[PDB]
Amino acid sequence: ADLSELLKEGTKEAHDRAENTQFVKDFLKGNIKKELFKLATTALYFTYSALEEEMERNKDHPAFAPLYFPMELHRKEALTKDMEYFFGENWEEQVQCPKAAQKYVERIHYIGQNEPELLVAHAYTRYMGDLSGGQVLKKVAQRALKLPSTGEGTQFYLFENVDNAQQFKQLYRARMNALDLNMKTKERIVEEANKAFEYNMQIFNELDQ
Structure with a gap:
């Protein structure tokens, strides 16, 4: 089966868990104050810094190179x-x-x-x-937070180099599904994705306290 499909289904539970955390729900309802948002943003900075460091390190690696998109996706500069x-x-x-x-x-x-x-x-x-x-x-x-309308403080959320989000997102899935991978390696990826969702849940809980 398709890796994107194995991921949609095999991570649906851990996705809804982290999505139903108290921090995410408070955020959607506009109830997060500046200092707490600064803490959450700090966490995103060090996380994306780490991930993009490893993506650059493996930019040539056959098991990842097709998904290397520094201009389209990377967030470190915005953060x-x-x-x-x-x-x-x-x-x-x-x-x-x-x-x-x-x-x-x-x-x-x-x-x-x-x-x-x-x-x-x-x-x-x-x-x-x-x-x-x-x-x-x-x-x-x-x-x-009553942020300036010139976008200061929310640049993390703007993908300035992606014309159409829906079209790029399709191209990315297709590249991922075309990676030469046996069925064993595929299942490790789904389990590592569940691990990632778990880490992000623990980051959210830390912010709640």
């Missing part, structure tokens, strides 16, 4: 602008990676340096999710 907006120019001195997020970062670096064929598990749970929910989540944050 840097948002950190600059929320904390000022010396923001790096002002923040530390949260404990649950550091555990996820370690797992990203381990996968990128030892089992690169599973990197697609972490890319698929991140950017494909990010691509669809971007505009909806951008709007609620701008309103809740």
